[PDB]
Amino acid sequence: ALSLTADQMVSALLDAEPPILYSEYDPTRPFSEASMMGLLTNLADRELVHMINWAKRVPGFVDLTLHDQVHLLECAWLEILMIGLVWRSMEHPGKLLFAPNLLLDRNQGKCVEGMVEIFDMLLATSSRFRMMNLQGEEFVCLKSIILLNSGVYTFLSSTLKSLEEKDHIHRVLDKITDTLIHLMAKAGLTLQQQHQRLAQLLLILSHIRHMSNKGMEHLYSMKCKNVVPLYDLLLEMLDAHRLHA
Amino acid sequence: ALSLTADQMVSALLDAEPPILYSEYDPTRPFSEASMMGLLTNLADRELVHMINWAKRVPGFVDLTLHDQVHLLECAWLEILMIGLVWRSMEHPGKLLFAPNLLLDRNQGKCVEGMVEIFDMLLATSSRFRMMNLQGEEFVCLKSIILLNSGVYTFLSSTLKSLEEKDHIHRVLDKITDTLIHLMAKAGLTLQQQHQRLAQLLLILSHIRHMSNKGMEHLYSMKCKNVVPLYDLLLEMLDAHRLHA
Ligand SMILES: C[C@@H]1CN(CCOc2ccc([C@@H]3Oc4ccc(O)cc4S[C@@H]3c3ccc(O)cc3)cc2)C[C@H]1C
Ligand SMILES: C[C@@H]1CN(CCOc2ccc([C@@H]3Oc4ccc(O)cc4S[C@@H]3c3ccc(O)cc3)cc2)C[C@H]1C
């Protein structure tokens, strides 16, 4: 990613996109009977496996140590799910497209205590993306920045190796920055609009962090899933052999 | 701020800076006997009055409705205190300069259950600012962006007035973006370093949001202060008469 062109980064990021999954419930059966958090939790957990696959395809990520890859994903996984959700909801004003067969409005969020607060922030972010006319090429840049940025300030250590890792990450972030500006210039924005648009995009990332933090707080009162530490579960998924090569 | 030059914005922001306050404790008396959270809370509350004064001097802020000014400050006050703290700690490696007479290391943070976690993030942010060689002119831009950005996605409404307000804020943020790039160009960074440095600065704001969220979670288990709603207290401070004109 530090020798990749802007064009090569964009195509690698587009190539790495995960699939859109469906909610798993019998569509021949009634709805009051479904647990909305059960449905949402089951969806999010299935997405997580595809998120690791994606992460490994972001330029520069697998050059990191396994521990650092784990750390970054443990820090960013809910931000990554949420930016994905806001992106697929953009063309669905007033609703959240959790899955193609699970499109929910704010009143359906009231179904779970404390959830409408989260729904309302996601919906607002979706509206901001639509208003900005966010582009698919810009979106994949933003999602990769979330992956690389959100945990880079909290690694414990400052070993030599740790210092090298942080350097590499900042270097990859720099290339994604170069890519976003390249995208915008190719689109014919002026120099001034480029830097303004870059700032507008990066400041939305502060809101997505906010939503992740509040959603983690909200999740930690429900059942959703807290068995086996997330780090261990991530480590397992990430620590693959090369036997099915 | 939408007709202010880059130079005029920078000088208005420098002119608006709040003073550095001292911790209030008898320096002739021992320390084990002081409540660290009492000291910290008393300091932070005294800063808040100066924060409103400052906010009113940020270009474009008082053109907002009183309700919107309240909202922005209710959303950003801890981010604003924290970026201030990390800025005055930059030249004090391993320590947090809460006040000139209150410089604390991570081990002094262990004094309060769950506080060392927060200290360690603040310290890391301070280290990142030092490594970036953040400049006083850049800092005041970042603090004003925090003020205008952190609550602009969560206003309830979407009245006409509400829509106009959001427009004005995005317009002011755009000018601060223009100011940061101006600063960097005047410093002789290349076009490419400008946009890279702008992105590095704006991504730190995602970490400061993170620290605010975690600190709000941590504060909500202690005594610190929760009497009278923050909105009302802010409204009072902000809703000034013009009699002492
Ligand atoms: C192994 C770990 C345990 N899993 C627990 C469940 O996590 C989730 C459960 C539900 C969702 C909720 O449903 C989804 C589903 C898919 C998606 O892409 C985004 C969201 S966001 C939403 C939500 C998030 C926070 C909140 O407070 C309220 C709603 C999102 C995550 C998460 C997984 C990484
Ligand atoms: C009227 C409202 C009630 N006041 C309650 C006390 O708030 C604070 C109390 C202590 C601090 C703690 O002390 C300071 C003091 C000054 C400063 O500029 C920054 C900090 S940060 C730190 C802290 C923050 C969060 C945390 O979990 C642990 C430590 C920061 C804020 C906050 C005020 C807006």
Swiss-Prot record, chains A, B:
Q: What else is known?
A: Selective estrogen receptor modulators (SERMs), such as tamoxifen, raloxifene, toremifene, lasofoxifene, clomifene, femarelle and ormeloxifene, have tissue selective agonistic and antagonistic effects on the estrogen receptor (ER). They interfere with the ER association with coactivators or corepressors, mainly involving the AF-2 domain.
Associated clinical condition: Estrogen resistance: A disorder characterized by partial or complete resistance to estrogens, in the presence of elevated estrogen serum levels. Clinical features include absence of the pubertal growth spurt, delayed bone maturation, unfused epiphyses, reduced bone mineral density, osteoporosis, continued growth into adulthood and very tall adult stature. Glucose intolerance, hyperinsulinemia and lipid abnormalities may also be present.
For binding 17beta-estradiol, which residues are annotated in this chain's numbering? E47, R88, H218
Which tissues does the record link to its expression? Widely expressed. Not expressed in the pituitary gland.
- Positions carrying Phosphotyrosine are Y231
Task: Report residue spans for region: Interaction with AKAP13.
Answer: 1-245
Q: Where in the cell is it found?
A: Nucleus; Golgi apparatus; Cell membrane
Record domain NR LBD: where: 5-241
Q: Tell me the GO BP annotations in alphabetical order.
A: androgen metabolic process; antral ovarian follicle growth; cellular response to estradiol stimulus; cellular response to estrogen stimulus; chromatin remodeling; epithelial cell development; epithelial cell proliferation involved in mammary gland duct elongation; estrogen receptor signaling pathway
- Spell out the subunit comment: Binds DNA as a homodimer. Can form a heterodimer with ESR2. Interacts with FOXC2, MAP1S, SLC30A9, UBE1C and NCOA3 coactivator. Interacts with PELP1, the interaction is enhanced by 17-beta-estradiol, the interaction increases ESR1 transcriptional activity. Interacts with EP300; the interaction is estrogen-dependent and enhanced by CITED1. Interacts with CITED1; the interaction is estrogen-dependent. Interacts with NCOA5 and NCOA6 coactivators. Interacts with NCOA7; the interaction is a ligand-inducible. Interacts with PHB2, and UBE1C. Interacts with AKAP13. Interacts with CUEDC2.
Q: What is this protein called?
A: Estrogen receptor
Lipid addition (S-palmitoyl cysteine) is recorded at C141
Q: Does the keyword Lyase apply?
A: no
Q: Family membership, please give it.
A: Belongs to the nuclear hormone receptor family. NR3 subfamily.
GO CC, alphabetical? chromatin; cytoplasm; cytosol; euchromatin; Golgi apparatus; membrane; nucleoplasm; nucleus
Q: Which GO terms describe its molecular function?
A: 14-3-3 protein binding; ATPase binding; beta-catenin binding; calmodulin binding; chromatin binding; DNA-binding transcription activator activity, RNA polymerase II-specific; DNA-binding transcription factor activity; DNA-binding transcription factor activity, RNA polymerase II-specific
What does its UniProt record remark on the domains? Answer: Composed of three domains: a modulating N-terminal domain, a DNA-binding domain and a C-terminal ligand-binding domain. The modulating domain, also known as A/B or AF-1 domain has a ligand-independent transactivation function. The C-terminus contains a ligand-dependent transactivation domain, also known as E/F or AF-2 domain which overlaps with the ligand binding domain. AF-1 and AF-2 activate transcription independently and synergistically and act in a promoter- and cell-specific manner. AF-1 seems to provide the major transactivation function in differentiated cells.
Protein keywords: Activator, Cell membrane, Cytoplasm, Disease variant, DNA-binding, Glycoprotein, Golgi apparatus, Lipid-binding, Lipoprotein, Membrane, Metal-binding, Methylation, Nucleus, Osteoporosis, Palmitate, Phosphoprotein, Receptor, Steroid-binding, Transcription, Transcription regulation, Transmembrane, Ubl conjugation, Zinc, Zinc-finger
Q: What is the effect of changing Q69H?
A: In ESTRR; results in highly reduced activity
- Describe the effect of G94V: Destabilizes the receptor and decreases its affinity for estradiol at 25 degrees Celsius, but not at 4 degrees Celsius
Q: Which domain of life is it from?
A: Eukaryota
Q: Which organism is it from?
A: Homo sapiens
Q: What is its main location?
A: nucleus
What does this protein's UniProt record list under function?
Nuclear hormone receptor. The steroid hormones and their receptors are involved in the regulation of eukaryotic gene expression and affect cellular proliferation and differentiation in target tissues. Ligand-dependent nuclear transactivation involves either direct homodimer binding to a palindromic estrogen response element (ERE) sequence or association with other DNA-binding transcription factors, such as AP-1/c-Jun, c-Fos, ATF-2, Sp1 and Sp3, to mediate ERE-independent signaling.
| Segments for region (Self-association) | 1-245
